[PDB]
Amino acid sequence: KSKKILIVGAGFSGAVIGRQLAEKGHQVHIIDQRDHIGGNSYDARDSETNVMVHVYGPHIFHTDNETVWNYVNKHAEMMPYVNRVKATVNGQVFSLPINLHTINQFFSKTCSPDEARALIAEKGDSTIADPQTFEEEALRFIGKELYEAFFKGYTIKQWGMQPSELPASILKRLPVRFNYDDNYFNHKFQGMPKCGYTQMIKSILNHENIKVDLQREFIVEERTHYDHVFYSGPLDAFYGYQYGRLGYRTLDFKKFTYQGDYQGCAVMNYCSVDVPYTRITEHKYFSPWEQHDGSVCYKEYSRACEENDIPYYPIRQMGEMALLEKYLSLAENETNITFVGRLGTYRYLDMDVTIAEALKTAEVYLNSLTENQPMPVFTVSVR
Ligand SMILES: Cc1cc2nc3c(=O)[nH]c(=O)nc-3n(C[C@H](O)[C@H](O)[C@H](O)COP(=O)(O)OP(=O)(O)OC[C@H]3O[C@@H](n4cnc5c(N)ncnc54)[C@H](O)[C@@H]3O)c2cc1C
Secondary structure (H helix, E strand, O other): OOOOOEOOOHHHHHHHHHHHHHOOOEEEEEEOOOOOOOOOHOOOEEOOOOOOOOOOOEOOEOOOHHHHHHHHHHHHOOOOOOOOOEEOOOOEEEEEOOEEEHHHHHHOOOOOOHHHHHHHOOOOOOOOOOOOEHHHHHHHHHOOHHHHHHHHHHOOOOOOOOOOOOEEEHHHOOEEEOOOOOOOEEEEEEEEEEHHHHHHHHHHHHOOOOOEEEEOOOOHHHHHHHOEOOOOOOOHOOOOOOOOOOEEEEEEEOOOOOOOOOOOOOOEEEEEOOOOOEEEEEHHHEEEOOOEEEEEEEEEOOOOOOOOOOEEOOOOOHHHHHHHHHHHHHHOOOOOEEEEEHHHHHOOOHHHHHHHHHHHHHHHHHHHOOOOOOOOOOOOOOO
């Protein structure tokens, strides 16, 4: 039986479920409230500069999942790109994550790796028996100068919270690498789509069995015209925020164009509270195989997600999870729908993890047909 599917969202979740289902002969209808596909992974070429701009902030592709890597290479030319981050703080510029250079530079030293391990040990705060706080976990690990330089002000700006208000759980391991490797990400596969994520997702959507409708908001009544709905929209929004809004940080991006080269790297973090933006991204650096005279940059600002804002980073502490549980027990009562994705499940997910879950979701749904069985509302655990 060729099933009639509605998908709410044209991001990775929607596109990847859609395409898997379309290929098995189902009639997939994808809608998006935005005037463009891609969801938050969307990029577009600035008309004045011709720079590929990542519209909703830097998107760097990285995965240890070979299946997912193979999948993206089917839909794009993946360019070798290894993300490297600088941070400005204390009137100095450092490598991130904290590594041997960061240390040697920070302390005006020349430590070998083993010498640096001793320094971090004799810099770690030897007091709080059982650290209960992110502040004290950090202090135990790296000590005061580094906690303050690299962690304190960044948390306050990014989360609108004191690190003393967060649990020790946030920092499981010593955040230092005892060599000169300055790759930000440890993933096996790391690349950048030559022609961008939007072209990649356009290719993913490129199937006879998929109809895309843009500038179209979901309306609950439509539900009855379909065999099943896959919903990648905000879970609380689906229920009209009847219990209250789920906690999110929003981001404002202030766009500006520079002639030449504004910062000389893709991403520069500003760890200080004395800098109101959190980082500056210079988009042309995500495409090193291109040359651009002009440069589009974003100053990035973190903020509480008020009602009109794009939700970005989920807060997810005790009271948020408490409020989620209310939606979850409404949702787990629903009959012909599956909530997926960063918003439908209130988790932060990377692109590769999105595609992974999206492939599995479709696999689960397809199986449920052959084996004539009910399709679950969640294919991944949410609590
Ligand atoms: C600031 C930031 C930076 C990121 N950078 C990286 C990175 O560098 N590397 C990485 O791996 N991942 C990155 N990500 C994660 C990446 O953005 C997500 O994995 C990806 O967006 C997941 O897409 P999705 O399809 O699951 O959901 P989304 O991309 O949010 O797509 C959902 C779509 O649904 C639409 N929609 C919602 N509600 C409705 C409705 N009611 N009706 C119609 N349409 C609706 C929205 O318009 C949207 O287009 C980043 C995330 C953030 C917040």
